[PDB]
Design a protein around this ligand. Structure first.
Ligand SMILES: [Cl-]
Ligand SMILES: [Cl-]
Lengths: 276, 276, 276, 275
């Protein structure tokens, strides 16, 4: 009785009729994968789960990352604990695609909502596929084939993360380990083949084949275009929600409007491959 | 009893526990009015209503406008019938505040959702109050006291009216009846006293006390600022929804992602007073 | 005898050793023509001429226009008098190419400096050829083949030119007679074959094959790019100067920094053909 | 000594004084007044040698000896900018000199030794004229705000190189020249005239505005301040001298003449803390 209800023409669907606290069937798994490929971000409501169950579910869709730094669930290290009482979250309140400064950015993620404020803290997603398709033909033709530099320091500037000696030493180390690198401006989804804009305000600094002046103008245009309401959805969280999204062709934005109230999410991240 | 559930800290509330298809009590009216003053846009789901009932409800909150052009319900002409079969809408997918080119723009309006596409057609609202309060102090201090020109031709350029000499002349006719005019950039809500940004991309052409070049830059900034996710909400419609918003301190955006599917809405518009 | 001294690599040359107050030979005319095709704007100093001599000189390079509205020399109506004591030249202080809202914008013009303030009032010219060549290849490739709308109302807005009955009626007549029209974004010079950007902030409102959002961004980029120092020159006038420029591939900007001091120029305008 | 204005916003040509020799107290003070009014001063047909150039510049403040760029060994206050040796493409962006320092240069004197036949113009823009041209509400908002200046805006990591040795040098340079702040509207420490004091080369942020607001306001100000109304464009001739006030101007040296050789000699005058 697995049911998929599209939320919006551009992206998003809600899944019901499946219980992911236990192992899903082969058919359910293929149905959800298909739903991911078509709808890009999937939501389940009233789906309480623990870390082990969250991990077993996410692992049906790829291999899982174990973060070395972020707080973790001890018995299930694939599940990262995001608790605002404990951890900074700043990088979330700006449109971004996860870790695109990496050679192989995350495939996507499964988020479970554990403890929420009464309201506030919505999360928006935008589809690079719908956004690319909506560009005029001359722009699609110009951009398809160009490359862009991505740089972690765009979201984690020395100005905010190098205030003290400890933080500074941390920043310089991350800088050293993640030099800027390039990805296609227009990414072909490695499974569906759907083409998507693949720049994001969070990490993209320069379209390589344009001059500095041109690149600045084109990126400002693309950042605005790709985050228009036509290409996005907005989720208002409820406890025990699960979100599962494809980070290869979307961006997201976490609204920062609920401080100082506590919010706790659990996150499992699926390893991705080289964008092309 | 009547229940008010906020949808986000910046604006928006859902109301349940009240049947607005009948004459509401004085206390219900006041509960809704004060919810409007706080939350700025209100939604009721599962509220089927006919045009007579919708007009009687809306009239509890001010005097109603009968629009001289658009199609209406003949037995209840205060209710505009907004159709797909009877209308085009190439001026809703721009952020706007209704008829701000008038000396007394609408107080607000009540929309009833009659027949909808399976999905698409969301409407967003943004709070000028939240957006104003979030500007840095120096910008708030600069803008509060300035004025801006609003001009219907911004959204209805001569080329739209169109081709013949009749339309130049009838466009000049509407121009003469609706010359460009000014409103405060920072409006004080005439009931609650809350201050709000009061410019909108649909009609605001110029901040009068700035140069053309400065104004162009500041308006582009304010248009982007005021429509950030932090100050907005996004409503996904269901048949028999009712939305009631305060047009004195909000803007809205109708997502253009459902054409040519039919979408029928009935609207009552409440008359407003002079912004200050 | 005829001597040509470039003022900069991008454009501009001073010419000397020819008396243009007399009928110049075919050889001299031809050398000046070649200098125009190369350098795009030419300056002769210490070149006193009267309107009849100015008209005979300009007419060697094409047919002359007799402008309907502006003041001109009675016995030489091909020469327009631009006297700030009479006519306001406040709208020459924006980068523009002359009358590109016409299906056949002027080929060029010959300007004679009659009476000048002690200082101030410089005029700058920028080269569409140099500007086009400096764009990166992907941008050159995208733009070459696109078209753009040009509209006299952009430099002649109703707000400034429609404020009296006579002003409005003249603005309407002009509007009826000159609806917006299109030209290539990248123009091929009809004699030299040299390609040039052919948009200008004065009149260009829209790149037609891009969306409004995209066009606005690309035009703001191009308006800024085309007017950078690398592609322009700045002329400090002296009495009896003559400037002769090719309006097919340049823009110019008259600095308004000398009011209320009186400035008087005489201008002859050469008729152009359809841009392609 | 004659002073001829070149433009309402800024610029004057000086003649009737031989600056290859020592000038009188009155001549020095006349030139100082001209600098305070016109902000950028030019002399033509003024051959000078390095010793004479340093002696002249030193009348207007103490001179800096640059730690990196080539100089005249007998007169090390005179820096040699010779495009056969030194790349000056960096000068082709609107900037005010070294504003990432707590005490940016007061000004500079340039002498043109060798020039291409054409190309290589230098533009200056007046922060005073640009400030005064802003509408009153905008002047009132900006006057009192501060902005961060950061050398890394013009010299990012990639400009130092990609090796670990390049990274280390860049990081040391950052530590020695950290981002710091100056008033957005600077009061000239001598004339008291107010000027916009941001520049595209080094200014990254107006501190009291949000990042979004700052980005928009700086883009407006960078464009506004460099409009033709507030600038002049100098076409060089051999033996020209330019003397300008770096406290309230920006400049832009057009890079359109390579590979033709171009040689300037420069004396740089030390400045004080902007306020
Ligand atoms: Cl220099
Ligand atoms: Cl220079």
């Amino acid at each position: 009785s697995l049911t998929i209800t599209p939320l919006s023409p551009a992206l998003g669907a809600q899944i019901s009729g499946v219980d992911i606290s236990r192992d899903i069937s082969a058919e359910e798994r293929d149905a959800i994968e298909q739903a991911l490929l078509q709808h890009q971000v999937l939501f389940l409501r009233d789906q309480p789960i623990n870390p082990e169950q969250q991990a077993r579910f996410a692992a049906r869709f790829g291999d899982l990352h174990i973060h070395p730094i972020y707080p973790n669930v001890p018995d299930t290290p694939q599940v990262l604990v995001l608790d605002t009482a404990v951890t900074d979250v700043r990088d979330n309140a700006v449109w971004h695609t996860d870790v695109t400064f990496l050679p192989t950015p995350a495939l996507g993620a499964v988020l479970s909502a554990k403890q929420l404020p009464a309201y506030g803290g919505d999360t928006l997603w935008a589809s690079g596929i719908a956004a690319f398709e909506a560009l005029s033909a001359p722009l699609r033709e110009m951009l398809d084939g160009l490359t862009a530099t991505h740089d972690f320091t765009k979201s984690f500037p020395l100005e905010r993360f190098g205030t003290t000696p400890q933080d500074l030493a941390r920043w310089e180390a991350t800088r050293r380990n993640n030099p800027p690198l390039s990805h296609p401006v227009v990414r072909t989804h490695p499974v569906s083949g759907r083409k998507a804009l693949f720049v994001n305000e969070g990490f993209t600094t320069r379209i390589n084949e344009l001059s500095e002046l041109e690149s600045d103008a084109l990126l400002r245009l693309l950042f605005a275009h790709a985050t228009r309401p036509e290409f996005s959805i907005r989720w208002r969280w409820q406890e025990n929600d699960v979100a599962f999204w494809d980070n290869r062709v979307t961006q997201h934005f976490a609204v920062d409007d609920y401080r100082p109230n506590r919010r706790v999410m659990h996150r499992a991240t699926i390893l991705g491959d080289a964008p092309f």
